[PDB]
Design a protein around this ligand. Structure first.
Ligand SMILES: [Zn+2]
Length: 46
């Protein structure tokens, strides 16, 4: 229950797959592609 914030602060995401840290979340999203590849949204035949 520790208190005390450093203003706006920050919360950089860290890839648990390899251990690479990223500034924002989006940066990590594209990185995840190297690990997982699930692109359901976007039919080809249909
Ligand atoms: Zn990674």
């Amino acid at each position: 229950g520790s208190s005390g914030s450093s203003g706006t602060g920050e919360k950089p995401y860290k890839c648990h797959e390899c251990g690479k840290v990223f500034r924002r979340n989006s940066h990590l999203a594209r990185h995840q592609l190297i690990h997982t590849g699930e692109k359901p949204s976007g039919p080809s035949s249909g």
